[PDB]
């Protein structure tokens, strides 16, 4: 299926930016399936 995906339901940039930047490293992802999917 996927890999760089967070269990956080998108809806707010900072909400998915803080985690994606602290989990994967860089803040660069999108909101797919109502969930923020970080990609590079």
Swiss-Prot record:
Positions of the site: Basic residue of the functional dyad? 30
Q: Which GO terms describe its cellular component?
A: extracellular region
**How is expression of this protein distributed across tissues?**
Expressed by the venom gland.
Task: Provide any one GO MF term from the record.
Answer: potassium channel regulator activity
Enumerate the UniProt keywords alphabetically. Calcium-activated potassium channel impairing toxin, Disulfide bond, Ion channel impairing toxin, Neurotoxin, Potassium channel impairing toxin, Secreted, Signal, Toxin
Location(s) in or outside the cell: Secreted
Chain positions of site Aromatic residue of the functional dyad: 39
The Swiss-Prot or TrEMBL note on domains reads:
Has the structural arrangement of an alpha-helix connected to a beta-sheet by disulfide bonds (CSalpha/beta).
Q: What does this protein do?
A: Potently blocks Kv1.3/KCNA3, Kv1.2/KCNA2, and Shaker potassium channels and inhibits high conductance calcium-activated potassium channels. Is potent against Kv1.3/KCNN3 (IC(50)=0.55 nM) and Kv1.2/KCNN2 (IC(50)=6.19 nM). It also stimulates the release of NO, IL-6 and TNF-alpha in J774.1 cells and presents a pro-inflammatory activity in mice.
Name this protein carries in UniProt: Potassium channel toxin alpha-KTx 12.1
Q: Which residues of the full protein are shown?
A: 23 to 62 of 62
């Amino acid at each position: 299926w996927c890999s760089t995906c967070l269990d956080l339901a998108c809806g707010a940039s900072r909400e998915c930016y803080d985690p994606c930047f602290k989990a994967f490293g860089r803040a660069h992802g999108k909101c797919m399936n109502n969930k923020c999917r970080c990609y590079t």
